Amino acid sequence: MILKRAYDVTPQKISTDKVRGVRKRVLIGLKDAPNFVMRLFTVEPGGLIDRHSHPWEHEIFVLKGKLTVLKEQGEETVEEGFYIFVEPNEIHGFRNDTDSEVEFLQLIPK
């Protein structure tokens, strides 16, 4: 088995015309698993993932903080302990309006 501390993984800052103030850690990656992968995202205060979509589903668990979820229309702010299923091709994004870091686990198929 692989049994490791998530926060020991080196984060990558993500910075594009559509993403700001976000770090990503790959926990269980393509070389480790046969079917789906596990990542941990940290959203800084003011960070933003603009609405977008991919052709695969996402499964998310909110680990820390008040995550604002951008939906195909509108938004909803949720807290640690919420889970999210995002359909294939469903437009969605995220924002952190609070003064502390938000963390969420994200899993996607290979």
Annotated binding-site residue numbers for Mn(2+): 52, 54, 58, 92
Q: Which residue has the tokens 């229309």?
A: 73
Which residue among 15, 45, 52, 87 contacts a copy of itself (CB under 8 A)? 87
Instruction: Considering the complex, state which of residue 15 and residue 52 has its C-beta at the smaller distance from a copy of itself.
Output: 52
d(CA 84, CA 72): 14
Nearer to a copy of itself, 3 or 99 (CB): 3
Is 63 near Cl ion (CB under 5 A)?
no
Which residue is listed with tokens 């969605």? 92
Q: How far is the CB of 15 from a copy of itself (least distance, A)?
A: 25
For residue 101, the SS3 value is coil
Least separation in angstroms between residue 17's CB and a copy of itself is 24
* Token digits of residue 59: 């499964």
Token duo for residue 36: 């789906």
